[PDB]
């Protein structure tokens, strides 16, 4: 539909991208399934909800730069206003770095609330909600919030939780060797990305009364601008905390989003600069979607599969599934945002949901794919969009998974 | 009963820190004085039943017996032990240190008995404030309990956290303090092994011939410790055979004593570590005091649930002054009289404080429970098993104020 540029002009919060605080779709409506079809299985992967920045230094470094300017008298009034905001953001996050916020828990309560409202026939008494997480507290506290909410919504669900190293091979897959096969020269690529997207000259004059250099700051202007942009976005993780929007023009807001958007496209998407197939990393997660759907479709019980993790794995999974046009390959720095937009893929509480439908007396299973609760296309033909035939989707995904070979990494192997 | 007789009646208790929690046999709870109703619960619970924390705790002993098997000096009893140990390792594979299904069921049972016995605490709109450490076994115990509470009363307000911000009281650690008082622990444990661990008979039961510690790769005392650990951890699984056929009644008691001593020494009242190692839990005691003050003054209704590790549960029990845990002795055999790990830190071990108020009276009462058994506190009371919170609080505050801990980490 709209350009990413127009979307971000209409809603500046979307430029936070990976830090965008999840919002339910404006429309509460759900596409009607073909006659006789009812939902019976839901399979999901959900990123943790809104969180603070992951390292104390992501607060401490830019704050100390501005406090020093203040102390030595070259911080402007806008600079002082910015410093005051960042001090409040840091105080909020103090000794809670990387951790889920109260707003982040509410996002996951809302996510399963809307699941329950939309597909009540899935969440019948005795149905086994199988929820799993990574070891990271932000991921499993998102699971914990969601599971307590489902238990409040229906006392009869059988809800189990785990956060086990035994599942890491698909719920938090990692292969540094594969990354190093493609990203060894990422330093060079990012220097080019910085010069294409990050334009710090105007902001430096807004922040400081006299001209400053990379050497007096302790960080380059490009780094300082990125750090201030990250703080502006992370303000969304808190209730009633203002950001730093007054530090960024609309074009700079768009460009700083583009800079992190490119990073995801490069490290985890279809960039030709990383040889187009970085999203092959999620073969195992894709296979776990296939196998657990196979089990639920053949099961005499009722099932729901919930997985809680990280955008590190969510972003490539959406591309590997073939959603929309995520697999489009381009090196045009400005064209990426056409088909690949992080706020539509990996916001806080970002999530993929597959809704499986069944009709009595018919072995023709249908599946509705949702990316952040919006219908998506899959690279197979269908006669009942937004619905797909599971037989066609399964064949395509299994063929994709079968074609991916991943290298030994440490003691881990295919 | 004595610890020796309790272990004769119920050998599973000798697993100590690995004993799989069981509810009290009677569903009865003591009657509060007239007009008193429970209104606040404050708890600290260890994670439920878990696998061993490191792969080497399975691999090392298993490889010893596989070596004996390959080279043909493993007895038939030895092969039987190897069979069960391979089974225990297979259960734990890639789940080292993790909560088991039984450990989750323990924590569901714990809150459902809180709910049954003190139902006036669990009313619509009450805030259940649950917090954990960052370790998955602790968090998942929390998560199992909170889902259970949600099912018992969806009107509760249940929040969950597992924050570095709570570590100073929910997972306290002070390596400097330990090195001040445990500096020669290596020497103390070599003596303790000599006192308690006697592997000659077991070595002859396991192997067809004498075997040197060099050929085993581990000393016979280490191997006996590892086999006893594997025997205990079988309790974490449903329907898993242990190794009871490798230990006589006397050895089972003595191996329990050896680990019991380790807790008494590192976390209890042993004169060998200068009698005040349980001072480590001053912050956790202060958190119990202040969250109780807040609940007593609150216009809302509250429950405080903390989920953690026996590293902190054991000293908390002693620092609160429960029963005779603070009794000081160097007599290796007398420890067990007043200090018994299966009564303090089993799997799902827990301290609960049940607070009661009477309408129109500011005299708050508190009932202290250790693994759901009433305990004494070093405070006078005119209505045991209940204590006046004003007296308990004054005693715990001065205990906390008397403690000096070094800045560490």
UniProtKB/TrEMBL annotation, chain A:
This is Histidine acid phosphatase.
């Amino acid at each position: 539909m709209q350009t990413a540029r127009d979307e971000i002009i209409q809603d500046p919060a979307l430029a936070a991208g990976k830090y965008y605080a999840y919002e339910a779709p404006v429309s509460d409506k759900v596409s009607k399934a073909p006659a006789g079809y009812e939902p019976f299985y839901i399979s999901a992967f959900a990123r943790h909800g809104s969180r603070y920045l992951t390292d104390e230094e992501k607060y401490a470094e830019p704050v100390s730069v501005l406090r020093k300017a203040d102390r030595e008298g070259y911080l402007t009034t806008d600079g002082k206003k910015a410093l005051q905001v960042m001090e409040r953001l840091w105080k909020e996050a103090e000794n809670r770095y990387g951790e889920l916020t109260a707003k982040g828990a509410a996002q996951h309560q809302g996510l399963v609330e809307r699941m329950y409202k939309h597909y009540p026939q899935v969440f019948v008494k005795g149905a086994h909600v199988d929820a799993r997480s990574t070891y990271k507290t932000r991921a499993f506290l998102s699971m914990a919030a969601a599971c307590v909410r489902l238990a409040q919504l229906n006392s009869g669900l059988l809800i189990t939780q785990d956060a086990s190293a035994h599942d890491a091979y698909y719920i938090k897959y990692k292969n540094k060797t594969f990354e190093q096969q493609h990203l060894a020269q990422s330093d060079s690529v990012y220097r080019i990305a910085d010069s294409v997207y990050v334009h710090p000259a105007r902001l430096m004059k807004q922040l400081f009364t006299r001209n400053v250099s990379a050497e007096e700051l302790g960080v380059s202007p490009v780094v300082l601008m990125g750090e201030l942009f990250e703080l502006d976005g992370i303000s969304q993780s808190s209730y009633g905390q203002e950001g730093l929007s007054f530090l960024f023009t609309d074009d700079e807001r768009y460009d700083m989003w583009q800079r992190n958007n490119f990073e995801w496209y490069y490290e985890k998407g279809a960039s030709p600069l990383s040889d187009c197939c970085m999203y092959h990393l999620e073969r195992n997660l894709l296979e776990n979607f296939i196998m657990t759907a196979d089990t639920a479709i053949a099961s005499p019980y009722r099932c729901v599969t919930l997985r809680y993790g990280h955008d590190t794995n969510l972003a490539p999974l959406a591309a590997l599934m073939g959603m929309n046009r995520l697999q489009t390959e381009t090196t045009d720095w400005q064209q990426i945002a056409d088909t690949y937009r992080t706020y539509r893929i990996i916001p806080m509480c970002g999530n993929i949901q597959l809704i499986f439908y069944r009709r009595k007396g018919s072995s023709d299973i249908l599946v509705k794919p949702l990316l952040n609760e919006r219908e998506v296309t899959l690279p197979v033909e269908t006669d009942c969009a937004p619905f797909y035939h599971w037989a066609d989707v399964r064949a395509y995904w299994q063929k994709v998974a079968d074609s991916i070979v991943l290298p030994d990494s440490g003691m881990q192997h295919d």
